[PDB]
DNA sequence: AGAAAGCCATTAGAG
DNA sequence: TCTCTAATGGCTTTC
């Protein structure tokens, strides 16, 4: 298991503020900028969306 | 069709 | 011990 840095998490949460779903093109940009795999980005949003439906 | 992505519940590792 | 969330697996949906 990898722990995400405060920076990685912020960038991701800032993006989620705009699109709760990512495009393949956007997912690739974020994966590179944050040094995570596309799978991790996909899962982060999967989880974030779940938290959102139960936390809002 | 079939590959890719999403929904969920649940697991388990880090601090 | 306990909390939070990265990750997993099976279905289901989208293209």
Please provide a written account of the structure.
Sequence-specific transcription factor which is part of a developmental regulatory system that regulates segmental identity in the mesothorax. Provides cells with specific positional identities on the anterior-posterior axis. Residues 1-56 bind DNA. The protein is mostly helical. The chain has one domain: Arc Repressor Mutant, subunit A (Orthogonal Bundle). The chain has helices spanning 6-16, 24-34, 38-54. The longest helix has 17 residues, at 38-54. The radius of gyration is 11 Å and the shape is globular. It binds a DNA duplex (15 and 15 nucleotides) through helix 3.
In short:
With 56 residues, the protein is mainly α.
Please supply descriptive tags for the structure shown above.
monomer, 56 residues, mainly alpha, Arc Repressor Mutant, subunit A, globular, DNA-binding
Query: CATH H level: which superfamily?
Result: Homeodomain-like
- Our measurement of the CA-to-CA distance between the termini, rounded to an integer number of angstroms, reads 27 Å
| CATH architectural arrangement | Orthogonal Bundle
- Element pattern in H and E: HHH
Strand percentage, roughly?
A: under 5%
Tally the helices.
Answer: 3
Rg, rounded, reads: 11 Å
Number of strands: 0
CATH class (first level) name: Mainly Alpha
Shape: globular
Number of domains: 1
DNA-binding region: 1-56
Function: Sequence-specific transcription factor which is part of a developmental regulatory system that regulates segmental identity in the mesothorax. Provides cells with specific positional identities on the anterior-posterior axis.
Family: Belongs to the Antp homeobox family.
Subcellular location: Nucleus
